[PDB]
Design a protein around this ligand. Sequence first.
Ligand SMILES: Nc1nc2c([nH]c(=O)n2[C@H]2C[C@H](O)[C@@H](COP(=O)(O)OP(=O)(O)OP(=O)(O)O)O2)c(=O)[nH]1
Ligand SMILES: Nc1nc2c([nH]c(=O)n2[C@H]2C[C@H](O)[C@@H](COP(=O)(O)OP(=O)(O)OP(=O)(O)O)O2)c(=O)[nH]1
Ligand SMILES: [Mg+2]
Ligand SMILES: [Mg+2]
Ligand SMILES: [Mg+2]
Ligand SMILES: [Mg+2]
Lengths: 138, 138
Amino acid sequence: AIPRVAVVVFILNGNSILLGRRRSSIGNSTFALPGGHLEFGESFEECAAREVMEETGLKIEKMKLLTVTNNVFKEAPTPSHYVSVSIRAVLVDPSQEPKNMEPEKCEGWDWYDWENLPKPLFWPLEKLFGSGFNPFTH
Amino acid sequence: AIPRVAVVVFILNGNSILLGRRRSSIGNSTFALPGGHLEFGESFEECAAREVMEETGLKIEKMKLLTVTNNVFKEAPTPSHYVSVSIRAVLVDPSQEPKNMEPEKCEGWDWYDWENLPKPLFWPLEKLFGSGFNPFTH
Ligand SMILES: Nc1nc2c([nH]c(=O)n2[C@H]2C[C@H](O)[C@@H](COP(=O)(O)OP(=O)(O)OP(=O)(O)O)O2)c(=O)[nH]1
Ligand SMILES: Nc1nc2c([nH]c(=O)n2[C@H]2C[C@H](O)[C@@H](COP(=O)(O)OP(=O)(O)OP(=O)(O)O)O2)c(=O)[nH]1
Ligand SMILES: [Mg+2]
Ligand SMILES: [Mg+2]
Ligand SMILES: [Mg+2]
Ligand SMILES: [Mg+2]
C-alpha cells in the first residue's frame, strides 16, 4: 500500500475529449481517459504519449501539464491510492481514428463533446470535473 | 524501482520561504523545502501539515496545490524517481519559530527572502524557479 503515480491524457479535438469505458476491477464500465502507470525514469510527456499509443494508436503532440489529483479508493477490496497527473494534448492528425488496442481493458475509445459528456464517468474524473476543472482552458 | 510521491511545502512568511540544508543521500548539503513521502490514504494537504510538523514543529494552514514536478535523480546511489507535489501554506501563528526536529536529516531551518535565496539550492527546486515559477503569485 503506497501511493502510485498515473498519467492521464486529455486529448482535445475540437470541443471534444477522448473517453472509453473501462473493463477493470476499479471503475468497471465507467468512462475514463487514456493513461496508465508512470514508469521509472519516464517523463510525464513520455508516459502520456506512450500510454496513448499503447491504448489507442493515436499520435499526440503539444503536451502540457494541467494538474495533479489525489485519488484514494478507500473502499476497494485491495488498497488503491493513485496520484494522477493530467496532461493536455492534441492529435498530430486530427482525422486519425482511435483503435481499441487493448480490448481486455477498454470497450473502445470515442470522442465526446464538452457540453454532452457521457455517464457514468470514472470517479476521479467526475471529482475533478465537479471542481470546475476545464482541460480546454486550465 | 517505481516513481514515488513526495509533497514539498512552500511556507510563505512575508516575502520569505523556509529552507534548510539536507543531510541525505540525495541533495546532501543543498537547501530544500520541508516535505517528504506521501503516505497511503493521506491527502496532499494532510501530508504537507504532517511533514512540516515532523520536520520543523511548525503549524501551518491554508494549504493550496501549486504544481507537480517529475524529478529523476540519476546521481542517486539507488533508483530514485520522485513526483513532487508542491503545496503553498502559511503559519497559523506568524511568530512561531522553526525547530530542527530531525537534526540527523537537516542542518536547520531558516527563512529566506525571495530576492536573496541561499546557494546551493537543491536542483529540483532550482529547476522549478528557473522556469519562472513563483510560489507567492502562482
Ligand atoms: N486510465 C485512467 N486512469 C485513471 C483516470 N483517473 C485516474 O485517477 N486514474 C488512475 C486509476 C487507474 O487505475 C490508474 C492506472 O491506470 P490504468 O488502470 O489505466 O492502468 P494501466 O493498465 O494503463 O497501467 P499500465 O499497465 O499501462 O502501466 O490511474 C482516468 O481518467 N483514466
Ligand atoms: N524534502 C524535500 N524533498 C524533495 C524536494 N524536491 C524534491 O524533488 N524532493 C524529493 C527528493 C527527496 O529524496 C524526496 C523525499 O523527500 P525526503 O528525503 O524529505 O523524505 P522524508 O524522509 O521526509 O519522507 P518521510 O520519511 O518524512 O515521510 O522528495 C524538496 O524541496 N524538499
Ligand atoms: Mg496502459
Ligand atoms: Mg490505462
Ligand atoms: Mg520527513
Ligand atoms: Mg523530508
